[PDB]
Amino acid sequence: PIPGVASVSPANGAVVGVAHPVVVTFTTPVTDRRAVERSIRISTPHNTTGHFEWVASNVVRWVPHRYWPPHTRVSVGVQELTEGFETGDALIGVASISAHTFTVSRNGEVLRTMPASLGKPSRPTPIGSFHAMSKERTVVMDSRTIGIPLNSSDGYLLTAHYAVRVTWSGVYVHSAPWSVNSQGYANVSHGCINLSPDNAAWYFDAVTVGDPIEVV
């Protein structure tokens, strides 16, 4: 007995970045995962391949291998639901732990190579292939939301701006005026990709939810 669908992301008619997963949420925990995966039909003109990942008992996402093509249509069907969305430009951000840089390219054209400070060795930025999950002009960075008491040495509580969520577990790209001196030279954050206010603002204005963010 199959659980009903609660929602699909992206929403119908959205224009998303090229690493946006198709996320299907169900009304109950899923017991037969293979049946749910077979039920999810994703179609795109370039026949992009990919794989399912179970990120909650009732949530599965399909992650496209090597990104969607830019400016393409994607159809999604599951049970009684059908929808369509599109991709926009391929706007790729590469955060380099060794180079201390965040490099953003649009459709192969490099737009900015920005000074960045990533996580210090004890509180590192995770290597991986991620996407922009949200845009928040202002956000409270609270160390308790990554498991660190405020009074501990790695504790922090502050308001940051131009915040783009990179991971489900709290890595952001954001404006970090306090670390401008380290940006381009040293990795001194608690895991976030620290940019200057002006570079963070530029990126924040350019970025779309779904846009790829690679940490290397």
Explain what the structure shows.
It contains two helices and 17 strands. By secondary structure, the chain is mainly β. The chain folds into two domains: 1-89, Sandwich (Immunoglobulin-like); 90-216, L,D-transpeptidase catalytic domain-like (Beta Barrel), CATH 2.40.440. Strands 11-10-9-17-12 form a five-stranded mixed β-sheet, covered by helices on one side. The chain has a four-stranded antiparallel β-sheet with strand order 1-3-6-5, with no helix packed on it. A hairpin with a 2-residue loop joins strand 7 and strand 8. The longest helix has 10 residues, at 197-206.
In short:
It is found in: Periplasm. With 216 residues, the chain is mostly beta strands.
Total strands: the figure is: 17
Strand content is 35-45%
* Order of H and E elements: EEEHEEEEEEEEEEEEEHE
Instruction: State the shape.
Output: globular
Report Rg: 18 Å
* CATH topology (level 3) name of the largest domain: L,D-transpeptidase catalytic domain-like
Largest sheet: 5 strands, mixed
CATH superfamily of the largest domain: L,D-transpeptidase catalytic domain-like
Number of domains: 2
CATH architecture label of the largest domain: Beta Barrel
Q: What separation lies between the terminal Cα atoms?
A: 43 Å
Helix content: under 10%
Coarse structural class: mainly beta
PDB class: transferase
Keywords: IG-like domain and beta barrel, cell wall modelling, transferase
Assembly: monomeric
Entry title: Crystal structure of LD transpeptidase LdtMt1 from M. tuberculosis
